[PDB]
Design a protein around this ligand. Structure first.
Ligand SMILES: Nc1ncnc2c1ncn2[C@@H]1O[C@H](COP(=O)(O)OP(=O)(O)O)[C@@H](O)[C@H]1O
Ligand SMILES: Nc1ncnc2c1ncn2[C@@H]1O[C@H](COP(=O)(O)OP(=O)(O)O)[C@@H](O)[C@H]1O
Ligand SMILES: Nc1ncnc2c1ncn2[C@@H]1O[C@H](COP(=O)(O)OP(=O)(O)O)[C@@H](O)[C@H]1O
Ligand SMILES: Nc1ncnc2c1ncn2[C@@H]1O[C@H](COP(=O)(O)OP(=O)(O)O)[C@@H](O)[C@H]1O
Ligand SMILES: [Mg+2]
Ligand SMILES: [Mg+2]
Lengths: 459, 488, 459, 493
């Protein structure tokens, strides 16, 4: 429909926001979430929830990947993005009914977002780098996790400067590089492949069948044993091909089986089989190594320069042309701190101070953007309320009292305990959301709401 | 008669659909397609290419709107709204008892008046030295280089003395600051098997849409093989046939070849031993692209060609961009733009804004004049048509006025999409146009500015408007005729 | 049914007449007319409309091919035939209800048709031949069209006398003969085939498979390569067969492909492939050439004596045993003028004067044919009315005033402007329908109405 | 709780029905009734007087809208629109988690704020000389003499020295036929009906009136009778008896002064006969109203009898006449003992009923001004400034009443918004621009033209709403919203 499709999108998106409004904060609800013949997965943190669920309305699916591809791949806090977007749409409904044009509301939300974002610069608190401090800053996310995370991201970093990196990390011991499971297949092969030229091949190993009316006919010994011998020789063709360009180990998908793996032992070519995309592209990005669609047709070039490759009872390679932990959260936070070392206190406090700023700046504004900015303020104030109700406290009561204590005490920190044990100051408990986390959160929520507001008709 | 009114309503439905997407405040239209991805753009040029082929009048609304303004000018969403309004008023004129042939002829006469008035509003812009560069910043600091690269793109490829027409040699292959100038048309993929030479200078290109397979005879077959060397000699057989095709292509010109369909196997290896670095494999594009670019005709066979056909492209190279590689050729018997901005959405935005640059520059090269947009040219044209209708008798008198009121929908649509009052601001602007004698000002439209439209520098060129009006009136002339719709 | 089937046929045919009553004259309506998965085709001139549409009632299909096979293949004006037929049936309905027998009405329509036809001799106006005049007479159907059409039909004409010819013309440049597209396939062949004996063969090129339990069995080199070589030799059989009777180029449908086309080059036999009926029968009627169902079994005899055959980037042949234009309407008109050089003015004027004649002769008539002839007059007067309403004028008003001005001014010319700009005299505007066009039109319409009137029961 | 949302939705439905009839550009509402004629009017007072009485909450809004405003003040439509707005906002406050009693408390406090603010915006209007006349032009192009007759009507009949409370003893009668400028200056009270009989004296001057609520028939025992008349002589005896006892009451009235009498209830068959022959043109018949009018005007001491009276009671009227308007006739009298009544001849049948309500607005306005002579400027201006003050007090208040006060502030602004949309202007745009021009220019007067002709300043156009009109409007609105915000379960046995 023409316009009422807009209110329909508001309803459809705020439906999602209300679905995950309970899973916000530490007292969130787990959501059973099975999958077809699969099993149960009960967790907070909507990041993994948005991956699941269903494609209901294309706006409800638009809620995903805007809350995922950025905040899950850049920041950490996902649930706040969708909750905020839903609230903004809820107030934009009252503004629509009042007679305000949608695009004016989107613009007002942009300007208000500028006000809040620029504040977060004023609320910010810097943290030192290069030793310690970061470690005791991770206990928020029990002791060694901080240390291992620190040195893990310290080893893999730009640092001078530009301050960006990912993805060289995945999965208690320390770590020297990236590691893989499985084996080179047939332990008679050497376990010491140091200085290895890795041949990454996603292909089959078969005699190149010609294209013609085929139907082979064979009579016992004579032709049959000559067939087995034939494709064994043709296998030696590929074997001697991999050793001409490069040397030592290779990596292969699909089939091996048969004798085959035997022959490569006699030719000293300890390959590995078999795995799909992961562990292929892993060793590809790690050492070398590009990818070969063939099947014996390649130049190297391609092969990777991995320094050490060993086997322990899962084979692991070190010294790569890249360090990966062995047994999420803080690993992203540290990255943000590497980008900008400032933090703002969480628990909805930054939202409250941002709301006070957007509203204080909205009182002096002409035309219609005034109401848009005020609606934005009331939208940011949904985080403290949701946080309050998820723990059982009276929403508007605790929220209002805090919003007053922030201007009287001049403290953009205190607000929503929330754990029902504490001094409410939020300075203690050390609850920090960094800077890029919140700035990206607001930018993403406003981007969503603007998009939905522009859309109309749309099938 | 009711068939006509059915057409009226059915077409004004399309117009009323895309009436909200007009102007810079368009509403984007999701529009998924088939089993594939989505494409979100206002600017109805992409919206007519999708949606639903429902009524033959809505169909006719497309492909008259698709390949005429979108392939000559740039404005498209305006044409359909103009036609829709023309039919909305044409319904009123049908109720009065006027025959549709009379409303069509009247619409033609009125359209002539409007087109002739456009020349009166025109403002000239010089060519051959800048002046266009500062003129393209309006089409989208991501605006500085776009004007430049587009300028030299159409300057390198143009008739220029004179007649001033050229298209199509320009395309784009997806930071913007890393967007590169261009020396020719460029391709992706590889020549297959990097053992091949990367310097194919003075290349004779052999374009083959054929498959490479030994000629299977036509007879009851059931081929059987006793193995040992009955199998190996079959391999050697079609290896000898592949080899028989290799030097058969090398007979008239060698260098590189371009092919579709299958290769695989060793095959390419044999071609390396004979030194024929071909490429594989691509469909319509890059077959016709390199055909029109260098040489080169097309060879459907399969043991039937002479050269003749082969293209005399000067240089062909392979460049590695990061890890994966792409091969690109220069010096052709011809230049095409290239962009890489990362994030994948930083392009397709630059592309859609760049196409407007080539279109506007080509329109300015054909005739170097502009009229100020924002619906003001429509208002001055409406005042012209109506001024002509007050001094005309009989029935065309009413048709012309209906045409005027139909031209005033663009300022109204531009006003309503920005949140202003549609008829109020429209009437106020039309007043200030005769009072101040200024065929320029009207519809802010961005809600920020001085309303003068002389500033903000919004230009629709000339053939943009002339084609928009001529096409809207041509469409309406068609729909106003016809009836029945057989559909066997 | 017995009789009411007659009124049903009247309704069914006048339904068609009313369908195309709007598309008459210059202000006709285009009619969308798609076709299954095809595209749109919007034009006046019902000639191409009757080809489309649908087979509804066998009388509605009887309306076709009587309006097509003659007036589209002889005259030009198709829509007037069906409109007239419908009107005649409409009046024949009132005559039926009055108590008149059908066959009497058909006879009366015949006699009335004689009156009108014989008039057209009195209304006629002669036009000179052999130079010019015809050219400025074609601008009705912008300058060169008259010239090219004139000399095109001048080159192909009997002229002494009997004055008939078609079809040697089809499809800006002048023309020396009939032309074809495609190529001789494989440009190594000669482009100069002058003095060519064309071998028109619609057949395949395959080894004559014997009739017995077959199932070939082959083992690689030995028998397989001998199979390829075999059918290549068998191909040389047909090659050497075409060169024994005739020489040079041939023409073939169906398959060639393979090497095949290669071998004919080495034997100098530049044939062409492949096309269906058209371009086969075109070169057949042009040069020579009959048609050979075989497949190597023929005597020549058959082959055509085309003088020149060349190739330009589409191969074209000249000097044939026949001239065709290169880039409809006037080409038929000129033919009629070649048959009879007289013309009558159109725009319904000839219909009005014919009506005045049939009615003037009907006033003095006994028995029932009186009413039949009068109905015929009122039937011819539908052309000026339809012409009037299609432009928007008052039908009966303009029609009546003209029918009066024709007897007062004694001018079988003026009537229906129709373009809303002119002096109504019809002498100017130079609107001419020749003679055979109108005479054939009336004869065909009366033939239709007579047929329908005779028919009854009929399944 | 959802019972409250049902009430809030129905009440806002009524409000949305009448927010299009707000202001001078308001709409009509066909409003037919029973088996009778139709009535199309603005001014929701009559709308609420009929409407469609369905939901008990709508019934409550009618109850309280007529309870105070229609019976004392003037503005009624504004009350229901404002109440509707306050409810529309209090709904979102309910969803926010606030308790209803707290919302009603905040609405009360904010209401007191606005009420106290109207005094600061107030302006003064003089009395006693031709100053109110030019200020009646707001109530309605026939104004020039409408205002004149209005002030004349209310000032002639008023306490005035002092006490400043007076109403009634004045009515209006439209006789349908003429043009609105045919309205005439008025003297005494005027009633319909007729003396009955055509041979009656049609102009009785210097009349001493006898107002009676009694039947004219000689009473009967009302025991269980079977009255059977025997001889024909007794037939004549009966007729003679009642012929005499009908007269026993006639000269009984004439001994205390006669001229014309006045009767309720029955005026019998002969009766009027016997009264013509005795030259006593009485009249029949009318209920309580129009009886007490002539009672207070002249004399008159209504007599419950029936042959028992001494005069004394009879009044002193100078002239009584019977005038025929078209076909039907009404008898009107001049020169009373004093009591004035207005007369309207508008024609077209629909041109009257407009002048009656438009005049009623005049009497009410002038009465309110006599009670307290203060005015605030209309067109939503007082509403805008009131909203400004309420939001000002709201920014400085903590806890939950804060939100309720802000909701009240936004709820006041519906009057300028409704006034805006009903005139064709952009509702929120013009209203917002005016709310800015009221703080920048510091002028609690300008806003909403509303006639689309003027300087928007509203100081000119002199649109006045008095003070008790606004104070009672806000008090009644907040009273309604207070009641509706409580009340659950809606029993309704
Ligand atoms: N100790 C804490 N006290 C108060 N609030 C907290 C605390 N820890 C986390 N939060 C709040 O929880 C919110 C959302 O976190 P969560 O519900 O885990 O999902 P996500 O991080 O994906 O939004 C954050 O905005 C943060 O303010
Ligand atoms: N800066 C601007 N201010 C006012 N109007 C504009 C501006 N830019 C473009 N327009 C108007 O938008 C109209 C339509 O453009 P658009 O909606 O992009 O689709 P299309 O160009 O295909 O019609 C044009 O007629 C033009 O007048
Ligand atoms: N310039 C003209 N003025 C008046 N009548 C015309 C003119 N040109 C053509 N006609 C009329 O149009 C009639 C039909 O032509 P048309 O509608 O094109 O289809 P068809 O020729 O197949 O009947 C003719 O009988 C002729 O009298
Ligand atoms: N001339 C005027 N200009 C602006 N507003 C006016 C004017 N006259 C009346 N109004 C507005 O009309 C509103 C309501 O009056 P009305 O529609 O008659 O019904 P009610 O008086 O019963 O509320 C008042 O609030 C007043 O502000
Ligand atoms: Mg545009
Ligand atoms: Mg009122």
């Amino acid at each position: 429909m023409g316009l009422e499709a807009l209110k329909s999108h508001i309803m459809a998106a705020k439906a999602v926001a209300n679905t995950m409004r309970t899973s916000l904060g530490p007292n969130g609800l787990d959501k059973m979430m099975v999958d077809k013949d699969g099993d149960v997965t009960v967790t907070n943190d909507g990041a993994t929830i948005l991956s699941m669920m269903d494609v209901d309305h294309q706006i409800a699916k638009l809620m995903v990947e805007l809350s995922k591809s950025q905040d899950d791949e850049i920041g950490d806090g996902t649930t706040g993005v969708v909750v905020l977007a839903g609230a903004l749409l809820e107030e934009a409904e009252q503004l629509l009914d009042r007679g305000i044009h949608p695009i004016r509301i989107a613009d007002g939300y942009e300007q208000a977002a500028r006000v809040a974002i620029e504040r977060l610069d004023k609320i910010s608190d810097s943290v030192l780098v290069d030793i310690k401090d970061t470690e005791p800053l991770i206990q928020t996310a029990h002791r060694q996790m901080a240390e291992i995370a620190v040195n893990a991201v310290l080893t893999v970093a730009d640092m001078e400067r530009r301050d960006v990196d990912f993805e060289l990390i995945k999965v208690t011991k320390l770590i020297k590089g990236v590691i893989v499971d499985k084996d080179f297949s047939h332990p008679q092969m050497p376990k010491k492949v140091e200085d290895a030229k890795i041949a990454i091949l996603t292909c089959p190993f078969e005699p190149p069948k010609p294209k013609t009316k085929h139907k082979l006919d064979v009579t016992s010994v004579e032709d049959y044993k000559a067939l087995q011998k034939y494709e064994k020789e043709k296998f030696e063709e590929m074997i001697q091909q991999i050793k001409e360009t490069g040397a030592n180990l290779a990596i292969c998908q699909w089939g091996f089986d048969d004798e085959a793996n035997h022959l490569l032992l006699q030719n000293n070519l300890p390959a590995v089989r078999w795995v799909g995309g992961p562990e292929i592209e892993l060793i590809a990005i790690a050492t070398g190594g590009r990818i070969v669609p063939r099947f014996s047709e390649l130049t190297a070039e391609k092969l990777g320069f991995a320094g050490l490759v060993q086997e322990i009872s899962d084979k692991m390679l070190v010294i790569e042309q890249a360090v990966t932990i062995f047994i999420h959260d803080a690993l992203c936070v540290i990255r943000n701190l590497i980008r900008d070392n400032r933090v703002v206190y969480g628990g909805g406090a930054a939202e409250i101070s941002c709301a006070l700023a957007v509203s204080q700046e909205a009182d002096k504004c002409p035309t219609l953007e005034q109401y848009a900015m005020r609606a934005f303020a009331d939208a940011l104030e949904v985080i403290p309320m949701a946080l309050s109700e998820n723990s059982g406290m009276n929403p508007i009561q605790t929220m209002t009292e805090v919003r007053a204590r922030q201007v009287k005490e001049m403290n953009p920190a205190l607000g929503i305990d929330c754990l029902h044990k504490g001094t409410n100051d939020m300075k203690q408990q050390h609850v920090i959301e960094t800077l890029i986390g919140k700035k990206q959160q607001i930018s993403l929520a406003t981007q969503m709401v603007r998009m939905i507001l522009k859309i109309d008709d749309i099938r």
